[PDB]
Design a protein around this nucleic acid. Structure first.
Ligand SMILES: Nc1ncnc2[nH]c(S)nc12
Ligand SMILES: [Zn+2]
Length: 271
DNA sequence: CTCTTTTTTCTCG
DNA sequence: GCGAGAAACAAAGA
């Protein structure tokens, strides 16, 4: 998932599991708990979920006053709220069991991670990761964004994907943002003019906030939190290779940029 | 059978 | 410090 999908999961979890006491925690893939599974099971069993927050693409469970469980879903991670008697599915790895149901984490590729850290170590954790600002008008300052772009010779798409200029863009939304802002993904950032940077800054906020409002992109929408998204119906370029651009009518092209599949309109996004 | 395709963090030169 | 490519892993399609 990208930031809008993670935010959708966050909202659903906030509505449903806040106030729930964890009865037990089980793992079939304990290796994904980077801070140690037995240690996490010992610390969190019997504790109450107080809230769910998010930073970039990271989900943060607030459990008791002193613990935070940092979860990253990476490429394919999925949570679901299931009955206590629900059968196990092939790629289910972890479960938090409550008195009236359970929260199951599944991940085909086993890339997702869990890390148990203390409340006062959350802000240093994200400082160490060098995560950039949230994509909001309040936190995403265009003036610093402009200065960072001016100083670099990096290509705009991979630089945006680094999460340092702004947090939360992944392959789908970076392609969508660059098409909306009429910028070629291989454009060197120090070549961008002030007006293009302004459009890019606002397009990042607008696309991500629209995707959040629509419940994220669910191209494969089934039996998991955040699966009822409608943003996939609003995609203009991502996965639209060979289809026509809604603005000019040229065919959308797919290329490889820094190892990622990249979808763009060659007319609207001049090299 | 092989090769390619689908977030983060590393090695290598 | 940099870019390129690989690594973690599983599965589907050409
Ligand atoms: N954390 C990242 N660093 C570099 N490139 C990236 N592409 C995506 S998606 N995430 C990252
Ligand atoms: Zn176009």
């Amino acid at each position: 998932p990208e930031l809008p999908e993670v935010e959708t999961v966050r909202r659903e979890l906030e509505k449903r599991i806040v106030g729930q006491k964890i009865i037990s925690i089980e793992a079939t893939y304990p290796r994904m708990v980077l801070t140690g599974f037995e240690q996490l099971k010992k610390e969190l069993t019997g504790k109450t979920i107080q809230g769910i927050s998010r930073r970039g693409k990271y989900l943060i469970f607030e459990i008791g006053d002193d613990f935070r469980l940092i979860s990253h879903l990476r490429m394919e991670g999925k949570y679901r709220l299931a009955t206590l008697d629900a059968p196990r599915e092939k790629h289910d790895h972890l479960t938090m069991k409550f008195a009236d149901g359970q929260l199951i984490y599944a991940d085909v590729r086993k890339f997702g991670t869990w890390e148990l850290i203390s409340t006062d170590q959350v802000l240093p954790y994200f400082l160490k990761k060098k995560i950039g600002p949230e994509p909001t008008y309040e936190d995403f300052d265009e003036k610093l964004f402009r200065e960072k772009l001016r100083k670099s010779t990096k290509k705009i798409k991979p630089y945006l994907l680094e999460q340092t200029l702004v947090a939360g863009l992944g392959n789908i939304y970076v392609d969508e943002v660059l098409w909306l802002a009429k910028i070629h993904p291989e454009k060197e950032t120090n070549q961008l003019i002030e007006s293009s940077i302004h459009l890019l800054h606002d397009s990042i906020i607008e696309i991500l906030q629209k995707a959040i409002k629509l419940g994220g992109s669910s191209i494969r929408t089934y039996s998991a939190l955040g699966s009822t998204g409608k943003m996939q119906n609003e995609l203009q370029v991502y996965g639209k290779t060979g289809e026509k651009c809604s603005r000019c009518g040229a065919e959308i092209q797919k290329i490889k940029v820094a190892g990622r599949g990249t979808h763009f309109c060659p007319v609207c996004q001049q090299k």
